[PDB]
Symmetry: D5
Subunit: 139 residues, 10 copies
């Protein structure tokens, strides 16, 4: 069945631009292959990602993701069955908050969180979903 | 009363347009006679069809379809009473995914399924329904 | 309070144009007097009528209609309380399906029934209501 | 398919018990033939009956009832499709408010009605149904 | 996923008791093998059956059933996904309305149908389900 | 808290324009003072008014109204707490059906009632509300 | 149709016991005649009553009550249509909170109000309803 | 998690313009620091404020607010969790009813209250929220 | 109208039994006076309390509680209107988790929170309510 | 906040009784420490486990479980917030379907799955939850 996974993690000190590109390059390729789609949000040293696809494939990808030393302290936010995909457009799209309009992002971060900075650990499943959805719609 | 049937099947190897034309020519005659309407979706060697009409007639048409050597491994996706028809316009309309806007089809496939290719067996009733309805609206 | 009655009947062989005219003449006058409004659908030798108004008045009108030899085999489709009327503009409007554009009536009839021709007996209460409502809104 | 009808009417002045006994007699026979069930409530000179069964059959039975001179001023209370019957065990049981506890029926009446006496005309469809159902369940043995 | 199929059919004229037994013998075996359960109702010359199991398996079983000459004029009542099974206890159980308390089935049949006799064609999907469920509970 | 009252009454025979002016004159002043807003419908010799505001204030205003000999046979339609007001614009506005589009009112009256003429007594609370709201939305000038 | 009125009022200073007996005497007779039932609560110099019955009847009885100099500052708590009555047993029953068990009423009072003493003006419609219903049930 | 607090209070007699400005300036600073947003409505000698943010932070802010002698007779109107904020744009902006279009305020005040003047104590939590939201929506300028 | 408040706080280091008795003594008197009822829970150095009553009275009681030096770091859990009271029986009642049957409290604390020990800050408003509810429904003397 | 994770996996070939004991020993100690509770079901060579607790702790425990060589092919079934725990009684309880009453498990396995044997991969989140709860209530 079709499912959506949402999880967050902490970028590991030393995360470089080529690291991000490498991650995206591999993600796009593997997801296209596995029928997975989604978005990756990176800001304030934090990662927030959502993956949509088959139950077995999405789980396998997450298990693989947990092995990447480029981040740590991963936390599952949500995993449930869905009737339709929300994040259809990309196999995997990387959105860097630091490159967005300061006002637009601070307002979005406030809208769906109680934090003074991007802190996904302070956000519920629904707030992460709606947060990513707005970023997706902007892309 | 008024019912809707949805089922999927695998096209028998060697299938060509003549077969589809024949299927369509007879479907239109029989369906118009039996008060049946619907749409037939063909793509990636798979069949996804829906019929609306009388409980008895729709069931009879299905039994006749199961005897057709042009496809096999049929699977019922759904059968239930409905308040009104969605596939009203045609006694039977053929839609070939390979001949529709490929960009539109790819997004549609991802939207209602977890597969990398058109695979109705990985889709739920509602998914097949919404998928077919969008195709219907495109015609 | 306010109620809506829906019933169907079989026109008696030999039903002429002037008979309908006489039925309509009496209907408009009587319903206006009783505060009743509605629509009379005639097609395929079948009658499908809806009456809105007082519980007592609508009941008395139906009883009176049952005495009319111009039709027979009357069948009640539904009778229930309603918050507001739908068929407001006419004390009684006559709608002959043969006076409508073929394809338009074809689609509408298929949309709310599994029949290949107008057959109210094969329609549910809601189907008859929605059918009559579209005919009403069309004008 | 399966539908339920509820209507009310005024009993003709002079209506006696035997005339009511003849009704129930002819009703039980026909309702058994047409696959119709339900019950008839009589009180304060008013009739409140519910019939369950086929759409056409229930409709035809009602058209036949309208010709009966034993009552008049009939009013349909409701007609709708039902998933299952409520008055199953009864083809056509009779119930006279002027029978059981004049205190029980009194409470039941008030519960589903604003009238000081039995007056189905002042009752809604749901009130009529609930009223009849409670009676049904009451007289079961 | 888990699904439930309900269909009705007309028993072929001349249906014998040994035919019923052959039907049940085959059902039990194949249904156990395919993880399918359900109940077969036979009365007034009509058949009313429900099958629960996988979408593919139940589908194939129906296709097979359609080829059986012991009945005809098959009509699908419903096919939908379900969260849990209702007819568990039997890979396939047969219930003959004729061998039941004439008064019991009389009230059951009336409860979920407008007909004066067992007529599944005049019953809705929900009515067939409830009918079968109560039958299942006896 | 905030509540809405809806009631109906029969205008006294011989209701003149001065009587109407006086009623509206006093209504506007008092309602303004009490923080009450609403609309008064007059047609077919009947009154259908709605008052929104404080529970005690609306209640007292109704009590005074019942003392006005310029109408009678008053009947309460509804009284309940509301989250927000609908009839906000006027402390009290008079809407005379006979001064509006004859066909427009006929259809509006039919839309929310089973009567052949304006008869609020045959209408439910929901019907009276929507009827008034539609009149309110039209009489916005 | 069937409706329910709930209102509160201030007993006029000087309210004697014979007044209550007289109020009840007339109430029992009139309500029985008008098909009205309900409960009358008196306490802390305040009245709280509910009347169920016809819309016209209940409205007229309230109008009469408003002319009774034995009380004043009447406030309507609610007036709505109901499918069935709650206070069926009595055409009118009087309950004097001052003659009930201390703790018993203390709890009831607190349960449906923020007041330490009986004050219906501080209670919502639902609160007055449930409060009156429990008194009804205890009797 | 994310929460919203709404409370009302009476301005202390003698409060002046500079007093109000001092409240807003200090509030914006602290709220910005604590991830809190909201609006302060002032009218008819009454205060109606909403704060959105963290459960701990908003609570502590309210504690501090209670110590401010510039107002008194404070009453909590509501405190609950929320899926998303409504008052996103301002750390804490002051909105004076007396500065807005009299006719606009009057209709807004009547819409969500039974009072003839601005009286937050006569309003429910839902009315206060909707009142503040509309005020906020019509104060986004151009 | 009738409302319910729920808040948590940290007991000040050194909190003694006499202090709890004093807190309870005054609470009972004041609450009885103010028409307030409620429950007080104390465990693992934390307080979880709920108060039901008038919007104004409950708010003032909370403001008073905030000035109490015997606890600190208060956090409001919820404040909303209610149709009827749940904690009706006592002007105030104290339940000490440290004195309850081990298995009983362990199970209750797990049931409404993700913590291995009592920690109201990790609990939602609903969780706090149901938790207090069960303590309230628990017969005195268990 | 309080969350519940449900996941399934395949027991590595050779998994025996002693393996399960060691798993339980460590699970009870670690879960008690992390405030985690739940239940582990083992049957037909498959694992079905649910964990309730903190978002972060539950997530970290799952990451550790994924590194255990005693199983493989892990698939997440569900991860969502919950108002209250269902599997309260144990830090971790093991249930071996093989030691259960053959007919008790057959009935339960059929009730929540379309499989002829225990196959969690063919079950939904609701089915897995209800299946686990019924086992929990009879532990
Ligand atoms: C934040 C983050 C997100 C990632 N997302 C994906 C993804 O969506 N798909 C994928 O295949 N790999 C992803 N990876 C990488 C993964 O860990 C592997 O390197 C890759 O899956 C291996 O083949 C991600 C890594 C990180 C750090
Ligand atoms: C994929 C597929 C769909 C078909 N759909 C229909 C249909 O909708 N109606 C119909 O009469 N026949 C349909 N047929 C054909 C059917 O099998 C008969 O050949 C035909 O009904 C004979 O006259 C279909 C056949 C195939 C292979
Ligand atoms: C199909 C049909 C519909 C009719 N509808 C009405 C109606 O809506 N109102 C009415 O007064 N009479 C109606 N009549 C006529 C009625 O039977 C009387 O002849 C008339 O009411 C007498 O005066 C209808 C007759 C037929 C055959
Ligand atoms: C109050 C009342 C109820 C009746 N109910 C039925 C009924 O349920 N079924 C029926 O066949 N006839 C009923 N009849 C009688 C019917 O009108 C016929 O006279 C009879 O059906 C003819 O054979 C009823 C008559 C009355 C007055
Ligand atoms: C009314 C009826 C019901 C049947 N039900 C089943 C069934 O549930 N399962 C099954 O395998 N076969 C069933 N069969 C038989 C089927 O048609 C095959 O003969 C058998 O499955 C072949 O191996 C049924 C036949 C009839 C007439
Ligand atoms: C139909 C009608 C409506 C009225 N509405 C109001 C009203 O909204 N407000 C008001 O103060 N008086 C109203 N009055 C008048 C009231 O009866 C008093 O005369 C007035 O309130 C006295 O000061 C109304 C009178 C009538 C007949
Ligand atoms: C508090 C109160 C309640 C009353 N309730 C009723 C009542 O329920 N029914 C009634 O007829 N009269 C009632 N009355 C009396 C009424 O005011 C009349 O005196 C009586 O209706 C006149 O005839 C009540 C009076 C008071 C003061
Ligand atoms: C009506 C009013 C609203 C206030 N709102 C805030 C506020 O939102 N945030 C804040 O930090 N202080 C606020 N304060 C001020 C507060 O009382 C402190 O002076 C400040 O928080 C101290 O550091 C407010 C004061 C008043 C009178
Ligand atoms: C945990 C705690 C709970 C308290 N609860 C109340 C209470 O419910 N009511 C009250 O009047 N005081 C309460 N107090 C005390 C309050 O702080 C005052 O000392 C008292 O209200 C003063 O008069 C409480 C104090 C603490 C530390
Ligand atoms: C099926 C299975 C379930 C497990 N469940 C847990 C668990 O609930 N908690 C835990 O700490 N470890 C669990 N483990 C073990 C885990 O993989 C570690 O070995 C342990 O957490 C290390 O310290 C499980 C292992 C398996 C194979």
């Amino acid at each position: 069945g079709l499912h959506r996974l949402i999880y967050l993690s902490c970028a590991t000190d030393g995360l470089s631009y080529p690291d991000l590109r490498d991650i995206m390059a591999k993600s796009e390729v593997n997801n296209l292959r596995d029928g997975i789609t989604g978005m990756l949000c990176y800001g304030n040293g934090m990662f927030l990602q959502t993956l949509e696809g088959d139950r077995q494939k999405v789980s396998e990808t997450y298990a693989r993701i947990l092995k990447d030393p480029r981040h740590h302290s991963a936390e599952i936010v949500e995993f449930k069955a869905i009737e339709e995909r929300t994040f259809i457009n990309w196999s995997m799209r990387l959105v860097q908050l630091g490159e967005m309009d300061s006002d637009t992002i601070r307002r979005l971060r406030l809208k769906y969180s109680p934090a003074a900075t991007f802190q996904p650990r302070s956000m519920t499943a629904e707030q992460c979903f709606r947060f990513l959805k707005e970023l997706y719609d902007m892309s």
